[PDB]
C-alpha cells in the first residue's frame, strides 16, 4: 500500500510511503507528473 495520488500523506520524503514516483505533499501524495 504505496502512497497515490491521492492518499493522504505528509511531506517526509526521507521515508516515502509512496510509490516510486509519487511524492507527499502535506495532506496527501502528489502524483509528481507534470
Given at each position: 500500500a504505496?502512497?497515490?495520488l491521492?492518499?493522504?500523506c505528509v511531506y517526509v520524503?526521507?521515508?516515502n510511503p509512496?510509490?516510486?514516483g509519487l511524492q507527499c505533499?502535506?495532506?496527501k501524495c502528489l502524483?509528481?507528473?507534470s
Open positions: 504505496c502512497g497515490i491521492h492518499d493522504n520524503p526521507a521515508q509512496c510509490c516510486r505533499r502535506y495532506g502524483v509528481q507528473v
